[PDB]
Ligand binder design. Structure first.
Ligand SMILES: Nc1ncnc2c1ncn2[C@@H]1O[C@H](COP(=O)(O)OP(=O)(O)OC[C@H]2O[C@H](O)[C@H](O)[C@@H]2O)[C@@H](O)[C@H]1O
Ligand SMILES: Nc1ncnc2c1ncn2[C@@H]1O[C@H](COP(=O)(O)OP(=O)(O)OC[C@H]2O[C@H](O)[C@H](O)[C@@H]2O)[C@@H](O)[C@H]1O
Ligand SMILES: [Zn+2]
Ligand SMILES: [Zn+2]
Lengths: 299, 301
């Protein structure tokens, strides 16, 4: 057992030890809510509770490839809000930057498409954008798959014209991963090597309600500690018909068999400040946030 | 990761089954093994149950077996339940093939997702079976504080009288013990799985799309050396990892890849796949006799 106790304090002590060389961060929409971007599944405020005007059969249909090919209009109307480049990164994002600058970040796997990891200064090599990007777009026809740049797709979205491919007249969509679509090739190539050598999983701002991303927590070695920083416990629940996690694939924070998983419940920004304080990084983190935000405000 | 099959074919499985290494077989079955009996499955286009619920005006097909939707709108399920009641059909060749595995001392367990009871009618006993998605046999009040049990005849009476079954003690809804989405699986599912998959020598997967958890996880619970044979109309368990996939990452079948070492896909009718495997094992005549007499015996009632 690598943690001396199942607390943030225990995780911090482990992080400072020579045994903790490589950290993987797994993040979702929760890490961007304090920047002003709603998550997906939070009641009332979440995106899936705010799609009534689109008259969908159910909320998730707006990001389902099969529904999209039949009724693409709602997604492209919503896309005007989803397009990145008008929010600043959060304290949580800069904490991951700090991990990078301390030589501790093996990888950040993100489910987000807001690009705040990149704006916060994480580089392409540090990142797996697991659910894709707006940066590039592709024709949906597998036979054709013609690629279109951000400007091309952006021009179509903000002109309210449904993007059609110039070669085959099929729909063109941004490379954000829809339900039913394959994840980027980088996800799998990085996963297979990263998870053999990870010393700590830092899971932040995700409900772990979607596969294959939810599987990642179970790819780590059994000895690797896992810290969740989130408003609610995620990944720990009793099995039931239609559960997302595979049997035994979840977190165990609270059973009498718990040995490596720690749930810090609260806001991601505040959890990262608390961890930073325990590591003696709090002033460094605060200075980085202040400087980088002021640098963004400069333009 | 020892390779126990000499070749990734049905003939290689048959040879492995005849060797001394193969002592314990587990069957994992779904609605595909019962369509030839006249019971449609769930997810097949046009024929499947989920494509034939228009009359109930559901938000989506699965709602009719979702516990939250049920409590709020119980009427549609109970209307459908009149059709779901088991005992108007005969078991299939596939069911009798599993019975033959029992009698040959090869069957450790059959885990079924079905509630049609055809495994029992074919001669599999309580001890041989894990009815993973429950049963009509018993019914219970839905209130966690009460859980008052009701017998088969009590639920029938309410269903065919078209009265929504209510608890005589606490007046909460009473439903048959079939597992709805969002509900716990039977205790027996977990207790059996914990021990059964430690020393299983062969997995026989038949007539399922492996589209629901936690049942879909069962193929990953076998040792990495245990061969796995799929007998199904379509390939299931093998797919490129996509957003919203049911299987956990790397928890699927590997039939077609370069690394493929233990998994075999026999594509076609479950009954025909079972007849074919039986022939390779020398049981063809024994299986056909069993099916004839049992069908006759049921008709002879
Ligand atoms: N400030 C905060 N601090 C801590 N936790 C938070 C905060 N805000 C929200 N949360 C928690 O953060 C979590 C947000 O969960 P979800 O909204 O499901 O986002 P995902 O990234 O996991 O969604 C994954 C995919 O699903 C979609 O289909 C898309 O494809 C997504 O990429 C919850 O547990 C909140 O309590
Ligand atoms: N005669 C046949 N021979 C071979 N394969 C067949 C045959 N007929 C159908 N199939 C295949 O059989 C498969 C039928 O798959 P599904 O209809 O999803 O049934 P499940 O048992 O997996 O459903 C699991 C749960 O989901 C529900 O919510 C309930 O809770 C269920 O208990 C397909 O791959 C067919 O191609
Ligand atoms: Zn095209
Ligand atoms: Zn009751």
């Amino acid at each position: 057992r690598l943690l001396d106790e199942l607390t943030l304090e225990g995780v911090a002590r482990y992080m400072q030890s020579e045994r903790c060389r490589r950290v993987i961060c797994l993040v979702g929409a929760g890490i961007s809510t304090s920047a002003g971007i709603p998550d997906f599944r939070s009641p009332s405020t979440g995106l899936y509770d705010n799609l009534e005007k689109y008259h969908l059969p159910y909320p998730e249909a707006i990001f389902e490839i099969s529904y999209f090919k039949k009724h693409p209009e709602p997604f492209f109307a919503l896309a005007k809000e989803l397009y990145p480049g008008q929010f600043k990164p959060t304290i949580c994002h800069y904490f991951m930057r700090l991990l990078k600058d301390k030589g501790l970040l093996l990888r950040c796997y993100t489910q987000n498409i807001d690009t705040l990891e990149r704006i916060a200064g994480l580089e392409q090599e540090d990142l797996v954008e697991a659910h894709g990007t707006f940066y590039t777009s592709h024709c949906v026809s597998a036979s054709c798959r013609h690629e279109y740049p951000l400007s091309w797709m952006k021009e179509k979205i903000f002109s309210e014209v449904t993007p059609k491919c110039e070669d085959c007249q099929s729909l063109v969509k941004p490379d954000i991963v829809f339900f039913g679509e394959s994840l980027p090739a980088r996800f799998f190539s990085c996963m297979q090597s990263d998870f053999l050598k990870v010393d700590l999983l830092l899971v932040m701002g995700t409900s772990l309600q979607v596969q294959p991303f939810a599987s990642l927590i179970s790819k780590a070695p059994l000895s690797t500690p896992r810290l969740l920083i989130n408003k609610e416990k995620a990944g720990q629940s009793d099995p039931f018909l239609g559960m997302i996690m595979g049997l035994g694939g979840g977190m165990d924070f609270d059973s009498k068999k718990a040995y490596r998983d720690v749930a810090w419940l609260g806001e991601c920004d505040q959890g990262c400040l608390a961890l930073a304080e325990l590591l003696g990084w709090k002033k460094e983190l605060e200075d980085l946030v202040r400087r980088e935000h002021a640098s963004i405000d400069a333009q």
